[PDB]
Write a protein that binds this ligand. Structure first.
Ligand SMILES: [Cl-]
Lengths: 125, 125, 125
């Protein structure tokens, strides 16, 4: 049995997607890019703004799901530019605090909407 | 307990891979590319054609596993070119209908066999 | 309830990630690169050495988790260069033996630290 996570705070899943799906006690979150739900646009043009927003979006989704950042078992972090890794990293760290989920990281050729960064994750209830 | 999913409709797993593995109530499907088991080749040379074939392939694999498109919790959609994003999404949505899995989307530098699109997923039984 | 996996034989999880996380009967392992913990650097400058070191590293994590390659349900294998596919593949197959996980494959634009190959997986306990 599957349950859709629709936070009113994270970017609205307008297509054939959902922000996340809860199943068998896990929350599977879509790949957040750095949009602001309130604008339907990027929080800003920099890796710094989009990374914060992305991490904020994941938080929103997770929290709507009944999960939390502390319960994220695994992320995949995708970058427009490998050169943005450390800055993204610093922000990712800050967003996760003491919690250190498993992680996969790479640079994509490009990301949806010319996005500089995308983060997905699997978390637990 | 891992159970191997081998659908005779989906491209054959001639490798060190299985089409999908079932474990603890969940189906972990490999990244499908647009190969048509019937032609033994890419369904066509077009993003549109490969995409259909990819989604259909996943369908075969899922149903073979005892799952279905409606029970897909999460997909990752990989493109050789980001400009194919909207066209991809349309063909994607048609395939899933009213079901809205979680999703992550990006453009890879390249895909195996020159493939224009690759899609993987996790689903439940 | 999440268990942090830390093998002293896989590359140290230095920064806001853990080699792997155990949750609800599954082990979600970070994307490994071909670092040799013993040398503090890439096993080698070629795909072959790094791929070997990547598959070694994963064994370590998985084993440390209480898992094993046998128990991997799904891997993601990421190439810096799509043409290392053949060569990598044979290495991967060797490490996994007769076990055939679900799999996804692609070439990233770039990988952490100029790595030529990264492999993540999920496995059962
Ligand atoms: Cl082994």
């Amino acid at each position: 049995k599957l349950t859709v996570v629709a936070s009113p705070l994270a970017p609205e899943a307008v297509g054939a997607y959902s922000q996340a799906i809860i199943c068998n006690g896990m929350v599977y979150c879509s790949g957040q890019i750095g949009l602001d739900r309130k604008t339907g646009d990027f929080a800003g043009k920099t890796i710094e703004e989009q990374s914060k927003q992305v991490m904020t979006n994941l938080k929103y989704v997770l929290e709507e799901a009944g999960s939390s950042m502390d319960k994220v078992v695994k992320t995949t972090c995708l970058l427009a530019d490998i050169k943005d890794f450390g800055v993204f990293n610093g922000i990712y760290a800050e967003a996760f605090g003491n919690h250190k989920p498993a992680r996969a990281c790479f640079a994509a050729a490009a990301l949806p909407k010319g996005a500089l960064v995308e983060v997905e994750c699997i978390a637990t209830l």
